[PDB]
Design a protein around this ligand. Structure first.
Ligand SMILES: CCCCCCCCCCCCCCCC(=O)OC[C@H](CSC[C@H](N)CO)OC(=O)CCCCCCCCCCCCCCC
Ligand SMILES: *[C@@H]1O[C@H](CO)[C@@H](O[C@@H]2O[C@H](CO)[C@@H](O[C@H]3O[C@H](CO)[C@@H](O)[C@H](O)[C@@H]3O)[C@H](O)[C@H]2NC(C)=O)[C@H](O)[C@H]1NC(C)=O
Ligand SMILES: *[C@@H]1O[C@H](CO)[C@@H](O[C@@H]2O[C@H](CO)[C@@H](O)[C@H](O)[C@H]2NC(C)=O)[C@H](O)[C@H]1NC(C)=O
Ligand SMILES: *[C@H]1O[C@H](CO)[C@@H](O)[C@H](O)[C@H]1NC(C)=O
Length: 549
């Protein structure tokens, strides 16, 4: 009861099959039999479809597959066996799949990949996922024999009990290596085997409390590793310092991320300057999200971090409860062009210190999105200390009504006031602006003349009148959806002579014909420009559909 499209793509998904359907053809290119009750797959179940390029067998209850079940699938590029009941993999399965590009074996209860190298024959393999949560317990030297380059290899071994050294060393080039480890017992040697191949290493769920550095005795390897990411990791002030020492081998590391990690800190840890690292190679981007520091004052005078960021260009510390980025700390950030402290507890008085005189000398973009700032003027005033600043995001902050005059950094051309609760826009906003987002507020009208404005975002408001075209002589983009606009003055969009894109949907457009003429005739002559589609209130029919005599 499977249905195929004219292109040879058949759906069999969730159809209660207890066995592969009979009478398949060589016309099929993609066969999806996910979520079925297919316990056994015989020698001849898939013998016909010799031109199959995609086989989706995910989450079916497969626990038995004959060694040569896939003997005629020489054109198969995508095989998905994840989440089944395979507790033993057979090398005979992958033998005839020299055209295999994607192999997902994750989610099955096997304990190891088996006694025979399963992938030597897969010469065009680009993606491979293996392992599980409860039982995968051993990686061995024969496991990846025959694998030269993989764009991605995911290994889930949260229950790993033993890793044979050099197991991953045979692989020449791994673009993205995702490892799920519950502890750090084998992280070091693993790290010694991937220094030549891994460009992006992603560590998930690892408790690194007991990590300890030791000199990697692998021959001079110019690690091509550009990105390193930790997710849901447990760290300590001690183990953290241990990790830092690892950088000497990944001289090219440019991006580091820490997602949902907890940093446990204690006072008993206080080494001299010899133990600590203050050289951060080429690390130029630091992203930190949802970082939990149980007890922050249990950290000695944090000067240890001042020499690490001299060269950092981009930093993001979000939703990690930051209330202060100490002045001296900021002055050390000589190269910082981008700083994103979204979702923290920043307020004027502490911002003042964070953005002191020589704070962030080169900052161009500063994001203080969800914080506790309350005065627009006060914030612009405090930020005057920043001379290179060109972009500022202070959206999602609850501000008081803005004055008629304000002081903002001079080169500022981007100001985001989205979701800030304002009800009125005054001249506090500079004429120097190029991009302005006051979308999702409480505005009734926009009367600000900004001659250099190229983009205005004013969606999600209550404007009953479209802002006069002469206000933005050279506008390229206007976003005024989700408002209360019922109509537009004849010829107004033809007055936006640089307009390239415009959002008008979610507005109650009055489509009676005397009125809606120009607007409808305009949407027809400029469909390319309208993003999304404005409909008529009442019928819901697209405005452009209306024609008047
Ligand atoms: C593989 C190598 C990767 C290398 C990555 C580089 C990491 C550096 C990132 C720069 C952090 C920028 C924000 C610092 C703000 C600050 O100083 O928070 C301090 C404030 C109070 S100031 C404290 C006083 N001055 C002391 O008496 O706390 C606060 O305001 C709130 C506490 C915020 C705690 C989280 C952020 C603190 C930085 C964490 C650094 C270690 C990260 C380890 C992750 C596993
Ligand atoms: C001006 O500030 C706006 C508010 O901060 C901002 O809108 C926000 O845009 C981000 C873009 O990623 C959205 O991100 C969230 O949602 C995505 C998926 O949709 C998630 O993957 C992200 O992790 C995140 O949770 C926000 O949803 C959106 N905020 C809202 C509520 O509208 C504008 O983009 C800024 N304007 C300009 C011109 O930059
Ligand atoms: C970032 O801004 C600073 C401050 O304006 C710039 O450095 C100053 O450049 C002037 C040149 O007119 C020198 O006279 C000063 O000595 C510098 N001030 C400092 C920091 O001591 C810097 O050039 C800007 N960087 C960028 C983004 O180009
Ligand atoms: C798969 O092909 C044969 C087995 O018939 C053998 O050479 C080896 O297992 C694989 N090929 C390679 C790359 O050596």
């Amino acid at each position: 009861s499977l249905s195929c499209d004219a292109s040879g793509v058949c759906d069999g998904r969730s159809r209660s099959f207890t066995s592969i359907p009979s009478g398949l053809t060589a016309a099929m290119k993609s066969l999806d039999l996910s979520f079925n009750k297919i316990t056994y797959i015989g020698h001849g179940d898939l013998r016909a479809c010799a031109n199959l390029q995609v086989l989706i067998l995910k989450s079916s209850r497969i626990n038995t597959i004959e060694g040569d079940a896939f003997y005629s699938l020489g054109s198969l590029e995508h095989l998905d066996l994840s989440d089944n009941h395979l507790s033993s993999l057979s090398s005979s399965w992958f033998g005839p799949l020299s055209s295999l590009k994607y192999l997902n074996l994750m989610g099955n209860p096997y304990q190891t990949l088996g006694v025979t190298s399963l992938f030597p024959n897969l010469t065009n393999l680009q993606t491979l996922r293996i392992g599980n949560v409860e039982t995968f317990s051993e990686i061995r030297r024969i496991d990846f024999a025959g694998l030269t380059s993989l764009n991605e290899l995911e290994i889930k071994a949260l229950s790993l009990r033993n890793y044979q050294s050099q197991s991953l060393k045979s692989i020449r080039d791994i673009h993205h290596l995702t490892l799920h480890l519950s502890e750090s017992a084998f992280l070091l040697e693993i790290f010694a085997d991937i220094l030549s191949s891994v460009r992006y290493l992603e560590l998930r769920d690892t408790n690194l409390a007991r990590f300890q550095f030791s000199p990697l005795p692998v021959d001079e390897v110019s690690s091509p590793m550009k990105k390193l990411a930790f997710r849901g990791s447990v760290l300590t002030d001690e183990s953290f310092n241990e990790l830092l020492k690892l950088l000497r081998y990944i001289l090219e590391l440019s991006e580091v991320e820490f997602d949902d990690c907890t940093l446990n800190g204690l006072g008993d840890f206080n080494p001299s300057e010899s133990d600590v690292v203050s050289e951060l190679g080429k690390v130029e981007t630091v992203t930190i999200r949802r970082l939990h520091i149980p007890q922050f004052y249990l950290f000695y005078d944090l000067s240890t971090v001042y020499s690490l960021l001299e060269k950092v260009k981009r930093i993001t510390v979000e939703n990690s409860k930051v209330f202060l980025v100490p002045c001296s700390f900021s002055q050390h950030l000589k190269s910082l062009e981008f700083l994103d402290l979204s979702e923290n507890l920043m307020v004027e008085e502490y911002l003042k210190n964070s953005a002191c005189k020589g704070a962030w000398p080169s900052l161009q973009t500063l994001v203080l999105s969800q914080n506790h700032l309350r005065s627009m003027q006060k914030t612009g005033e405090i930020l005057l200390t920043l001379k290179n600043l060109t972009s500022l995001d202070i959206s999602r902050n609850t501000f008081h009504p803005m004055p008629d005059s304000c002081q903002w950094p001079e080169k500022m051309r981007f100001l985001n006031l989205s979701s800030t609760g304002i009800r009125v826009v005054k001249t506090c906003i500079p004429q120097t602006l190029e991009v302005l987002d006051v979308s999702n507020n409480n505005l009734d009208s926009f009367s600000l003349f900004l001659p250099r404005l190229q983009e205005l975002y004013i969606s999600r408001n209550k404007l009953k009148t479209l802002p006069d075209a002469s206000l933005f002589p050279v506008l390229l983009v206007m976003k005024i959806s989700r408002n209360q606009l019922k109509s537009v003055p004849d010829g107004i969009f033809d007055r936006l002579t640089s307009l390239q894109k415009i959002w008008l949907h979610t507005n109650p457009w009055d489509c009676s014909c005397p009125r809606i003429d120009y607007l409808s005739r305009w949407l027809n002559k400029n469909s390319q420009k309208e993003q999304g589609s404005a409909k008529c209130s009442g019928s819901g029919k697209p405005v452009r559909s209306i024609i008047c005599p």
